[PDB]
Amino acid sequence: QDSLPDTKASGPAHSKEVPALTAVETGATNPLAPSDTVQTRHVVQRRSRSESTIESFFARGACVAIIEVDNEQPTTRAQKLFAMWRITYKDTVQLRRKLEFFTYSRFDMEFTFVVTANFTNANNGHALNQVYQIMYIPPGAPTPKSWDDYTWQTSSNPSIFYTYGAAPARISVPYVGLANAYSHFYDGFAKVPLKTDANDQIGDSLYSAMTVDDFGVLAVRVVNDHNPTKVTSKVRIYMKPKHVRVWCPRPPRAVPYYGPGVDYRNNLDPLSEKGLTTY
Amino acid sequence: QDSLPDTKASGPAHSKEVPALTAVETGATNPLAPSDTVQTRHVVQRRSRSESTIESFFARGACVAIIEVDNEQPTTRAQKLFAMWRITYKDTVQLRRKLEFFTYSRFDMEFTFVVTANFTNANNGHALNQVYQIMYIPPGAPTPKSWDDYTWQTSSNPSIFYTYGAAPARISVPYVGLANAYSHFYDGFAKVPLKTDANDQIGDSLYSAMTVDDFGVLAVRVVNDHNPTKVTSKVRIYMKPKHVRVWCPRPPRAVPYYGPGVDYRNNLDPLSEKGLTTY
Amino acid sequence: QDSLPDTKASGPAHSKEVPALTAVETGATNPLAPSDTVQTRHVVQRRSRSESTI
Amino acid sequence: ACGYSDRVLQLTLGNSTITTQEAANSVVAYGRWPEFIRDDEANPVDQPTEPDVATCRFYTLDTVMWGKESKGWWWKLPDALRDMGLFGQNMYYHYLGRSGYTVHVQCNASKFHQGALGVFAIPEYCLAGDSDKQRYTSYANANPGERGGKFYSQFNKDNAVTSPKREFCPVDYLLGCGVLLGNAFVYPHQIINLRTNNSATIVLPYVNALAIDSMVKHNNWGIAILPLSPLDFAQDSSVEIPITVTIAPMCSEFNGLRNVTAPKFQ
Amino acid sequence: GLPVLNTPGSNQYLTSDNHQSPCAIPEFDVTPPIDIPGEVKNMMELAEIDTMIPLNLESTKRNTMDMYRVTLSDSADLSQPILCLSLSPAFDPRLSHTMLGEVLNYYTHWAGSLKFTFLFCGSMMATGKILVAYAPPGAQPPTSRKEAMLGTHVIWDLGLQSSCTMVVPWISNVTYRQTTQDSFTEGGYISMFYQTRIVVPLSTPKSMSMLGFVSACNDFSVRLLRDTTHISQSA
Amino acid sequence: GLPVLNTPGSNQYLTSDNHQSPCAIPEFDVTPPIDIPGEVKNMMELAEIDTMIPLNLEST
Amino acid sequence: GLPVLNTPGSNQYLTSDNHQSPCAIPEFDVTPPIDIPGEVKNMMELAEIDTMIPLNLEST
Amino acid sequence: ISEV
Amino acid sequence: ISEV
Amino acid sequence: ISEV
Amino acid sequence: GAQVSSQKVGAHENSSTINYTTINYYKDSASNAASKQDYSQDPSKFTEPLKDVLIKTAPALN
Amino acid sequence: GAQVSSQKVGAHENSSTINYTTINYYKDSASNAASKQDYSQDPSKFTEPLKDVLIKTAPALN
Amino acid sequence: GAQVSSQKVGAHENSSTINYTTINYYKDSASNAASKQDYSQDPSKFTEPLKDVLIKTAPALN
């Protein structure tokens, strides 16, 4: 049973009960129903709010990153034989804005990985099917300096080895926060400048940032040695919050995002023009 | 129920019970809790040690070998048409160091095999999908002298035939030790020189080594006959101990490994510089 | 339950039972155990022949 | 009331007794007292010999001197006792042998001397070699007998690649084996801190991955004594005081009798 | 033919998965266990054993037996700290290589109380009182005894019980701190000062070592397994 | 070898599906919740709070 | 469409595995056994029969 | 099983 | 089912 | 089945 | 360990409570799917967070 | 042969003991997954391996 | 038709009779896997096939 309340039949009124008048100064919304101000009939209501529960509002994989990684001969220049992405939902805007209807959240996270590849050169032979390693490096673990150094041994970090052409890879992660909920907004600093500090750099930190490394990084590489032709791949990462609880609602973002904080810069004019008396 | 103990509330003390003083000469660690030296409040403790059980500390596939094998025309020179790897966890360092927190262990072993291939030459046509045979050769069984001699008939040795592009192959092995636990450290020799020996070579053996062939070898080959273009593959082997018991803890390795024994050679200076009174 | 038989403890002997002598001419193998020719201790045997079944 | 203290102990085994009036209690390694092989853990089937009081008694090794520049000493068991009375004879006449031990380390000084020795009992104490060749220490050099060996402050690589010494080169802060000395406290141990005690007593069960093994090929325990804090006295620069190690086999049993093993040490 | 539909994740290999696989040597006669002394059930058991702290990592002392010795003497400047250290048990160079620091470096987060035990190795004729303190973070790191004594502290009287334990209570905003250094999850400061001074009679050494030990209390745990920076391998 | 037959849909990824997947950090000790004020159970709760209308969207 | 997820090991062939497979000649009328003398149940039964040792492997 |  |  |  | 629940049926075939079955295959609850059988609550903590909540027929300011 | 156990739930959906099911498919126990329902023990054999273990409030050397 | 049997456990996790389950999916018994629960026998038909079998302590030739 999840339907919304029925409309009650109500008739005329001539009385001292005045539900239509109120005082919004108190901070409260007037809980009127149509039968408080008009004559209504009885309606057996069958609509429900099944699709706007917190779980159903977030139950979608949303793209949060596109990581590019190449497989080609290791030259001496800067290449993309492995790539690292600092885990975040703030590199894209659509899931960021839905989470930021709330100040705090607690959820498990499902990651699904879609991998696509293409040739870049008209032809230097071909390539055999590629296997990708996606290694999670938590804050503090050694990060790779080359695509096949010892960190890729992954004895303790979790890795996914994905085979090209297989169904998108997928894993779940528990609520891994250091606090009892994730903070979508943190009004504070990680350091405080003290009067006895030797210089001003010592106590300086970014406004509203918490830890430095946050959740760590995903390091991606193609495990195969290079073919004669170069192959470029992109890994697209989709995040879906599941088993979701959220606290303290907020106005949604109304002007374009400008970085990982709440800063704004342009297009500060979200509303269009409309005459006061134009329908 | 697996949570750690609650903190008990405790107040002031003025007494002859002195938990803060002890004598570490006895060989014992003083079992104090914060309520022995400060006033504490009651805290209902919910943290647990679920992730540092011996099983969870080792429950990761760790890379222990990269075996290279080629498929090309059998020439008269030295080729890699089949490869052999002596089974060990000491060719890499990360899993070796975690096992060596303990002197003895008993576990079953899961092996997962990730196989990647690539072309080496710009083009001499292509290659059809390769099948790989990974044959286990226990100490004493005949070892292959060529990639298709009779030993590959594998009537009694176990083999895996892996098809390129399929999910990584995986098998489990029981506790196969000759003793009641595996020895991660053996302070001894396999032979003793006797006074009546004809020469000194007869009783000479390597310090801390036990059997010669240990667990045997994995022999890997591509089953396909060669294509006109050469194809190189690598088999990466991941070991995960499961159903783990361990005995007699040891200090972890603090300076680089130098071989399969405990020998050291360089970088014998693991600690950095820090002033005695610098925070 | 598939373990092999336990070794029985046995001590000294001075007797007319002579298990060490036999005649292989009969076509039979002498079914001796170590406790027929040496002093043995008791051993609870846990090995099995699981891997050499047909 | 009548006066028992964990500082005053008497140990009696066979025909030998030890007294100490300045102990710091005693350690039973891993909480396990020694014991004989149980029938359900037994493996060789022949009846074992158990010499009992003839071998399970205190043997005192040669005294070593602790001076201001001493870096430490190490012994392996059963090796340090290979020539001790009937324990050595039983060890060499039998293929297999098993034994636990009581180790009593003795070092007295005075109320005006200071210093602290760490006494560690290590299962499978593998030590590092002196050269580029790995696992190359020879049997005679790995097994010094009651003489034991010493630690060094630094890695001195044997360079006579012609007539290699094939010796261990145990560096002290690396516990002779590539780990940091400070973590050796995870092993059963006591400290003889001269202001507090003059002896350390540690009871060692047999520890191995097997119920019984070859005592000639394999040492089960190593004893490492290192100055955690160096010896000092009054204002003299060359104080020396003795350190004596007395060890008793416990629950010794041997299997596989035949002719005697005669190792080549020289 | 049971009708089936393959979901995302099919055919991947996650190195932390937990699945069954065929046994390659079936019906093997496994050697049964024996009761070896010294069995370990949880890695936190190793972090609860006191191991000696390399407190002295000055130039000439680090990586020698002297990194474990802190010199106390009857002529020390009584106003100066004997030692100062940050509570970053997996990161501060004095704590990161203790058995406690080596186990925490395989985990990303830690929480609980810790205890520091100090051993005096002077002669029996030496006496002294020492203040060892812990300042929860957020204020100026103690430079004098006067500031150090306003935080958690123990005043140690040297005597027949040779050693003294100070417990650093878990006092934290977050429920778990990071094992790397981060100001958001910083742990505070340990300092030590003379409360009176070392006093010795004549014919007694005027200098002596103090050794320090650290271990976890029974409320300590770690989580999120990760690789350590303390071992590597070159190509 | 249970005999199986793969149906249409096999190996697709629908972003609104709802399936299980292996946990990448097993046996993690999750921080328990505390009772934070302000919990929301349905997005329609937010549409029931009065918010001020920008009624005057004339030019200036 | 029972939702399924393929694990590592899928599609490999381990020569010591032990699985079912379709019978290629269904409903075949098998010849029943008879009691032949000499049945063996374990290879260790053969190692318990005395066989003669080639003790003299000198040159000639 | 458990119907709900 | 039939356990054995 | 056997719940635990 | 099968959980059986009722589906809320939308379009009906010309054929009642239709059920569906769920079994969790993993030990970690993070691996679980979402059950989407979610309860709701009262908006009052946002719409009427007043110390004296008054009835809508009475004057808001008395 | 299905074993049913409880999951230790971390994050909770706005929907109790959630269970999971396991069946072993192979005869050899080496093929089994890990149950990770692991008990712990007392560190005393390492932290206090003393013949006379004394109480922390009493003097260590008497 | 599920058969449930006990596994003979080799290495034990720090967590008893562990069981495994089998169902035959084919009508022809040749399709079945091997149960490997195999009994053994006495070697006597090979080691002592004598008409008068004598006891090992007695003389073989009387």
Ligand SMILES: CCCCCCCCCCCCC/C=C/[C@@H](O)[C@H](N)CO
């Ligand atoms: C093999 C792949 C494993 C991938 C493991 C990823 C672990 C990290 C999951 C993080 C989910 C992040 C959600 C966002 C939280 C933030 O809002 C707050 N900054 C936390 O206070």
Ligand SMILES: CCCCCCCCCCCCC/C=C/[C@@H](O)[C@H](N)CO
């Ligand atoms: C078809 C592939 C089959 C692969 C079969 C592999 C069999 C061998 C498994 C060995 C696991 C080794 C773990 C290490 C043990 C060592 O520590 C000790 N040296 C034993 O005393």
Ligand SMILES: *C(=O)CCCCCCCCCCCCC
């Ligand atoms: C409750 O679970 C009672 C038994 C349900 C029987 C059907 C089980 C289907 C297989 C589940 C396997 C999970 C992974 C080993």
Ligand SMILES: *C(=O)CCCCCCCCCCCCC
């Ligand atoms: C206990 O096992 C009771 C019955 C469980 C029924 C579901 C079985 C699912 C199939 C298992 C097949 C194993 C390999 C033949």
Ligand SMILES: *C(=O)CCCCCCCCCCCCC
């Ligand atoms: C005995 O078999 C009782 C019922 C077991 C129920 C689980 C069956 C799993 C599917 C078997 C299908 C065989 C081929 C149609």
